[PDB]
Amino acid sequence: VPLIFKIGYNVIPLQDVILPTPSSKVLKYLIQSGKLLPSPIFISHLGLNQRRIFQTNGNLKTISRGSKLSSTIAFSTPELDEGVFETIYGKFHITIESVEIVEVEKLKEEVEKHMNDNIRVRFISPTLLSSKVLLPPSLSERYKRVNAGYSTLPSVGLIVAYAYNVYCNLIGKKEVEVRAFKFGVISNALSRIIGYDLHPVTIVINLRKARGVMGWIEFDIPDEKLKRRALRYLLASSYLGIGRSRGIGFGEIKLEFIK
Amino acid sequence: PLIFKIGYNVIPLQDVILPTPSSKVLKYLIQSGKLLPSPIFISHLGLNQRRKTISRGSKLSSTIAFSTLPELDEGVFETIYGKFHITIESVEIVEVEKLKEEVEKHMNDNIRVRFISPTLLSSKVLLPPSLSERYKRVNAGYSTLPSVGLIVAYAYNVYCNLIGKKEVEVRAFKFGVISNALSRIIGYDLHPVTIVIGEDSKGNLRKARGVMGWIEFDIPDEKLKRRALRYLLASSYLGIGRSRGIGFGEIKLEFIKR
């Protein structure tokens, strides 16, 4: 039976530390060297006071001994330990805050609770969605030279199209560009936007920079069948993140349902 | 066909209580044949460069725009809302063909669209026309966060009416879908607004929810940009979206050098 794991870590530096860029490198180092988990993967930036530490670009961030940093790792389809770990960035006490295991089928069931609820998507970390996902695939060649970049104001259609793609990979089915496109186009046509607070952000992936979006958007899809699909897909993205560079912590979303 | 864009100075000779929308004042004049013999746009009245109880002497401004010659006078006009001194601040006469020529000056410029008055764009303009019947019952309302595609789609429609050609839903749809796919959004400050549009058949107040603010963007495909500039340029005279004849959907178009 295929599953999604979402582990919440507490990460406490035992000495004053300078976090790497991106700050997800700390836990990535651990995982790579086989020290944290044996290895559709998401490794968050380290967070503090409900803000992720990502570099847009000033000086590097100092964290004092004892600060409670948090992290999330998420992946599909593995036993997990904690304790004091040594790293090139310093020594860290890593304990587990939470463990969520969701069966892909149980996602469909939670959708039903929210059929009459509005949808709030929050971009908790800068999110990088490519606009061309809503280009009709038959025109890919024609516009091959066009560099649209990442959307700094993504439409509901683009968001859910990205979610549908993540969902397909999650359930192990090949994503189909045409279904994604059609789904997003129709969603842009029919969605109702209730409110939003969006803004551009420029982030560091010498330096290589990218421009995406952060903030939140609240909306509804007033077609039962289309809403049911969107909720399912969004729910999956809420575990694995969305858009480019999720494995490094970008595209972190939090999904909220407003009664 | 030509486009006329007249800027009026509108000075109430007595303290006045403006109707809702405030464009009703000049609309009354035009309808009764008093301001012009008669693709039309009548702005809301503006004060201190922003679109209520208005004191005697306040310098309100208005803009009226329409397509085809000039037979326009000035002076004191009587209205159910009071007496007003209306003079002409400016007249722009632009040939529809000269629009195509100004497009070329801006091929390398970014595009800033500002919604100066609440703008009411229906999202369903980007619904594939073949699905209109299927989603007949779905009420999407007006977009409170319109995408570049929706904006330029609406512009294309206005342009068609301007040059007297029937708007084609399918061309609008395709043009907006492709524009959403390829546009680059540089910056923005948008927000929802819920406003009173006017009365209805029965006299009940009607509300609507739309957008105001600005959005800056580019279309990095030469051929598509050239089309979009032309259509946008036309919208910058005639406004955009629903209820332009009543002053909604007023846009100002700015080209940012790079």
Numbering used by the authors:
A (entry chain A): 1 to 39, 52 to 89, 95 to 222, 229 to 282
B (entry chain B): 2 to 39, 52 to 64, 73 to 89, 94 to 283
Question: Which passages does the manuscript contain on this structure?
Answer:
Although native SsoCas6 crystallized readily, reductive methylation of the surface lysine residues was required to produce well-diffracting crystals. Analysis with the PDBePISA server indicates that the four SsoCas6 monomers in the asymmetric unit assemble into two identical dimers (complexation significance score of 1), consistent with gel-filtration data that also suggested a dimer. The dimer interface was formed between the C-terminal domains of both proteins with an average buried surface area of 1349 Å2. The three non-conserved helices of the C-terminal domain are positioned at the interface and may be responsible for causing dimerization in a Cas6 protein that is typically monomeric.
In type I and III systems, pre-crRNA is processed by the Cas6 endonuclease, whereas type II systems utilize an alternative method involving host RNase III. Cas6 proteins typically consist of two tandem RRM (RNA-recognition motif)-like folds {also known as RAMP (repeat-associated mysterious protein) domains } with a diagnostic glycine-rich loop near the C-terminus.
